[PDB]
């Protein structure tokens, strides 16, 4: 009667705590994976940025050597 | 007439029912007495899970018969 | 059944789904709510990316579970 009711309420409280634990375990696992995925995507774009970085600095070094040759030539 | 509803923890409810009462009326009487929603209740008697639309006389449930109550509390 | 989708911008979306819905069908429902094309959506649950062909029941995603939405490039 009352005791069947009390046993049902205890089991409902027990299931609710089990669902909060799975919800927390799921969220902890997903945020850890997402943080890992975002760090990998940020690292990949930085390496693409540095590849363009040394490409333009190579171009600047080449432009400086040409600028030096032009300055010696046109200054009589 | 009187029938009994026993859980797997040994706790037993007594219900006053009519032989023409459907199993759904029985689950409703359990909710009125224990607050357990009928969608969480499963009733077994004489080796069969009982269907909501069928009557107690359909399952040959007479006076002082004992039904077994199973709760669906996880996954649903 | 009801599930939730949490975005990286702090919004939670609510979707009405059945356990046999595929992940692509879930992505379609997100498009109905947010206008995000399904090919740009990555859904994550329990630390893993979900495959479009698989159903929610295959991943044991039950009612009121929370999916994580991450968008592509």
Numbering used by the authors:
A (entry chain A): 113 to 188
B (entry chain D): 1 to 76
C (entry chain B): 1 to 73
List sentences from the manuscript.
In the current model, the E3 Ub ligase RNF168 recognizes these polyubiquitylated proteins and then ubiquitylates histone H2A, which serves as a recruitment signal for 53BP114–19. Recognition of ubiquitylated products by RNF168 relies on three distinct UBDs: MIU (motif interacting with Ub) 1, MIU2 and UMI (Ub-interacting motif [UIM]- and MIU-related UBD). Currently, it is postulated that UDM1 and UDM2 interact with different ubiquitylated targets: UDM1 is associated with RNF8-dependent polyubiquitylated targets, whereas UDM2 recognizes RNF168-dependent monoubiquitylated targets. In UDM1 and UDM2ΔC, the simultaneous interactions with Ubdist and Ubprox provide the specificity for K63 chains.
